Swiss-Prot record, chain B:
Name the record gives this protein: Protein transport protein Sec31A
Domain commentary: The ALG-2-binding site motif-2 (ABS-2) contains a PXPGF sequence that binds hydrophobic pocket 3 of PDCD6.
Record's keyword annotation contains Membrane: yes
Residues of the full protein shown: 1 to 334 of 1220
Compartmental location: Cytoplasm; Cytoplasmic vesicle, COPII-coated vesicle membrane; Endoplasmic reticulum membrane; Cytoplasm, Cytosol
Mod. after translation: Monoubiquitinated by the BCR(KLHL12) E3 ubiquitin ligase complex, leading to regulate the size of COPII coats.
Species this protein is from: Homo sapiens (Human)
Spans of repeat WD: 6-49, 70-112, 121-161, 167-207, 210-255, 259-299, 302-335
UniProt subunit comment: COPII is composed of at least 5 proteins: the SEC23/24 complex, the SEC13/31 complex and SAR1. SEC13 and SEC31 make a 2:2 tetramer that forms the edge element of the COPII outer coat. The tetramer self-assembles in multiple copies to form the complete polyhedral cage. Interacts (via WD 8) with SEC13. Interacts with PDCD6; interaction takes place in response to cytosolic calcium increase and leads to bridge together the BCR(KLHL12) complex and SEC31A, leading to monoubiquitination. Interacts with KLHL12.
Principal localisation: cytoplasm
Swiss-Prot record, chain C:
Organism listed in the record: Homo sapiens
Disease tied to this entry: Halperin-Birk syndrome: An autosomal recessive, congenital neurodevelopmental disorder characterized by intrauterine growth retardation, microcephaly, marked developmental delay, spastic quadriplegia with profound contractures, pseudobulbar palsy with recurrent aspirations, epilepsy, dysmorphism, neurosensory deafness, optic nerve atrophy with no eye fixation, and death in early childhood. Brain imaging shows semilobar holoprosencephaly and agenesis of corpus callosum.
WD repeat spans: 6-49, 70-113, 122-162, 168-208, 211-256, 260-300, 303-336
UniProt name for this protein: Protein transport protein Sec31A
Recorded domain comment: The ALG-2-binding site motif-2 (ABS-2) contains a PXPGF sequence that binds hydrophobic pocket 3 of PDCD6.
Amino acid sequence: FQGMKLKEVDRTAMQAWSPAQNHPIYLATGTSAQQLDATFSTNASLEIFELDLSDPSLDMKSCATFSSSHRYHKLIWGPYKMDDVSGVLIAGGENGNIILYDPSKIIAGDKEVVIAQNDKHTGPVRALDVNIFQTNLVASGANESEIYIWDLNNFATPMTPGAKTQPPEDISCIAWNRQVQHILASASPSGRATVWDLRKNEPIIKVSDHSNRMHCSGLAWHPDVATQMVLASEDDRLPVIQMWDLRFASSPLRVLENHARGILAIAWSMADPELLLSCGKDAKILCSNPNTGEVLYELPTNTQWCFDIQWCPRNPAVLSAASFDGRISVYSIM
Amino acid sequence: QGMKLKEVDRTAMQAWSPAQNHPIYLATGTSAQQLDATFSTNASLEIFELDLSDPSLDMKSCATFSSSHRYHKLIWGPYKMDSGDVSGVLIAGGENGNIILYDPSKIIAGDKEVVIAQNDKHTGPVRALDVNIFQTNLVASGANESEIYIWDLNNFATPMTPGAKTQPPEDISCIAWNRQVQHILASASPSGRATVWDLRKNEPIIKVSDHSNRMHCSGLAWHPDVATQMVLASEDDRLPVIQMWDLRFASSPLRVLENHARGILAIAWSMADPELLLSCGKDAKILCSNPNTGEVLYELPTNTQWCFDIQWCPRNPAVLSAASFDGRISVYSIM
Amino acid sequence: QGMKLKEVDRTAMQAWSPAQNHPIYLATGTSAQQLDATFSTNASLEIFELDLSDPSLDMKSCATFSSSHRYHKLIWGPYKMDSKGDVSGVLIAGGENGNIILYDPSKIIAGDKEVVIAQNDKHTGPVRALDVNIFQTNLVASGANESEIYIWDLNNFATPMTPGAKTQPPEDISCIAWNRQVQHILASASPSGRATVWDLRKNEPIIKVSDHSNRMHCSGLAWHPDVATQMVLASEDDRLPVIQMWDLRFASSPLRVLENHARGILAIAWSMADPELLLSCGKDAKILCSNPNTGEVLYELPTNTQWCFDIQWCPRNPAVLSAASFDGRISVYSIM
Amino acid sequence: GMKLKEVDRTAMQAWSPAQNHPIYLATGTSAQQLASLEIFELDLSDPSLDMKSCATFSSSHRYHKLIWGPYKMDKGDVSGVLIAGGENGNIILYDPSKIIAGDKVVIAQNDKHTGPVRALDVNIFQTNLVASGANESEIYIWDLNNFATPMTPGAKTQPPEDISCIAWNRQVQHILASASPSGRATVWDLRKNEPIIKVSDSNRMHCSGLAWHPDVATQMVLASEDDRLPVIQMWDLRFASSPLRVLENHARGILAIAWSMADPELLLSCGKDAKILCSNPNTGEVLYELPTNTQWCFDIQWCPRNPAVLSAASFDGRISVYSIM
């Protein structure tokens, strides 16, 4: 349908676009954990590619490669680093590992690229998010309801948004509120979302609709409405995106079932909040309006499923989606 | 559809002769997991010739051997150190750590010296055994306390390991060599957690589990042509399923087959036609399912008795055998 | 006193896996230069494994990939862009109509559907000349028709560079070889036996050598593994069936001429482990081993009445070598 | 003597023609034992006894005879036609290039004949000519270029006898021989369309094979399956009154023979004594005994392309490929 494929990167990896203000546009990829191909290789690398739209080739220019001892569950690029290339690459590892990488030291080709490392978490660090008002704060999530808040000015000692939710469930997604800096949301695999108030240091609201049929695959806050957030489900018994308004806690405002099967990933545009990307087990990449519920268009894709999708921060027309067939594809909605 | 070709009154563990061997033989040994009303602990190893040219339901008994051990597992490897007119080794897993190697050609010949080797290196019942289809001299075994041993039939005295034993210690339910890459092994625990080992790296390279709270593992099989796909069966009635796993998306099962009313006792994935997976249920049903779609292809005709050691014939890909509750061994054809 | 260890029934271009790779593999690809005794239509990529523990003359076939290309050249490089895989390197294959293909030997051995990394057709004829730099293992030099020489970077294989302006007259590049001491030196040769030596820091040729015989047909080019300025040129012409030894410091004429074959030399392989060993196959159906520094024949490998178009030393096991003959057999031999 | 390949089939078999590459072995469900037609590829490059199965065609017929003619009227990658003799007078032509390709494969079919079609032979000179035999002295000459109506070699033998074998002369294209189960053979000249000579034994023969000498135009052998006379009779039509020599190397009846075209000094025979013997027909001497188990073989065939290779089909359900090296 709409738009087209610009670039393709054949890596089974976690992705992160460089922050909005950085030039050139960079795509960092970190070899994905809990997956194996027929080679049965656990070889991990963190690579950085440049996005050149002046070139019509499907190949991106590789800029740097770092031979990692970790495979990743999450990879984000925050706009703030404690000291050429803006920000910090924060990677969620296995066995509670959190690694901070200096992307300018990776680009340059230095030997020491790790800023700091930690293993305080238990199990896979699947959830990571940077606060947009206090760009030094990172919220992390792993097993047994572990939610840590790291200050990049003093990364050795973390904090908590309050006492751990009981019973202890894994934290699958984490997201800082886009309008009120001390509000954070966490989701569990059962679709129970918790909203923490860091001023009160305790949960202020808990919302769940199905639970019995929900399998959470995504959490996002509305870029411009403080009390509005979405929850995606991967479960084929309930293949929906629940659109919540925290003013009305009993049930979601609306439900989007635009896919034939469960939703594997979502990305809500900060540039244009009327645009919400979603990947399905029906192998469709859709763009839906979260305010109407309407499908605006479909992106041209193959028979493969995508586990991750992200809007490019510097270029709102661009997005990348990582598929299970070992490919990262870069599209334009233009 | 189905067609019963042969039947014999044996309460036993079974193993078909290797695919290259002619004629077809069905080796049986007294199960350590079933008693009769007599409470007899007497054990034997009986080998039958499958004669598909004889139209009777009877199967010719070639040889019997009096065993001191009852078995939890019985397999027949294609490779035997030094040659005999019958191919391979009979590898038996007994109680109290025992692994016994039997020479099938010496059993059939009818002589007294049939044991190639023996050892009690393992702890508890030796429930899990598998032979590597690429390096046929290599055997994986599992028992209690997370022990996995790798045996070379060319130097059977000292075992090797897939890597450091996983903690906390749990029994090894099943062991299966990968059907596409020779240094890859998978083992399963009673709760249904499968560990994938790289033998060349000497470490577990991935672990998979779903609904481990309600799972009781009764089977593990690698897909014959897809290196990253495997199935895990559950004996528990709270979750009577077959989990289809693709290691390329190892976070949860790709597909879950729920075609039985009660827990699955045994599975058998055809090497010849991977679109045929047999399963025995506690609902007194033998089903054939396509693991790539989940649908039931057909049910094999059986009575009210459970069946629990389903095995496809390596040489004739249309033939299979199932051991039953009432102490019978039935041979069927699918065509 | 060396002997035969293995034999495979293939009419193909061959390449051993790099020295760091364990186990030892022998990659073969259907030859575009030869025609099978049965005019066989099939084109395939087949990788065998070398196992000296087994006394059999039969090699274990690891993987087969039905190809849409026949090959004029096949090389196995130690470097590959993506980390994933136990099988190290890339198979770089030169084909017809200017095609260059990169295969992932790790994907082939695993038996994967798509095994191609990248592929282009910038060249204008058969890509019969290929070589990987041993100091910048991400660099490949290729050659084809009308003096075309491209330098590829496997890290960003999209655009090639040139060693300088195409040498006039525009002749076909029969061989290309990176210097085995200096990373920026490359030598190319035409079928006429005109060899051009390039320095990539200068982007111009530093020397052009020729015997000026008009009885030379270039079949091979190799740099001395220990001496920067030394290199050999082999001739397939039955009138002048020699291997010329050039020292580019004293380039008025060749330093010495190895005249051990009664008929044209078809192929050469200079051992990097033992630079005192030079293999040579001829139209006199002899595979000889000579000391290039003395011109002395050390040994003749026992062979049939059949000719070999390709001979290669095993990088991981220096004593082992393989020879591909026109009679559709690739034979693996030993020397110690 | 070395086993190369083994296939678990109780079937009639036919090797691909001499000019065809690769070497194929076609098999078809036997009607003389207790349905489908498969083509396997002989890959002597592979060390295992396992043969690569290319295609399987589900047929509604069982076969009494399966031959592979080198000529095809049509234009695929595989040479010739597979000609099968079935039950109830069936003669079926199959396209082997279409079987191999995966196509849905019958060129022509007819049930002109009465009873089992146990005798089939393709002429090596006029390769479009196929001779068949069934019950009641029926001999038909089929032309693959005009298959619809057959020809006869002349008037049906009286009293009527079923045709157990049929063989075209290997030196003269218009000469053909037919043999009844009693071992009474008739030679027909198709220029005259009449029998030219008849040869027979004592009433102890059960004919199991008829074969002409590849190099001598007047010589042919008749094999006997009956245990009362377990012999191969060497006939020379230069003296048609009594055999030239009798070959009695088996302790029991001969089930099948295969006379090498590449080397006519090599005649294969398998018996109920469970031996596969190679003999020089011109001296009656046993040159080699192919090593086997105690199982009988009902069909033996030399490989047209690789003269050192042969295949024998057993009653115990296995078709084995051997080397006489």
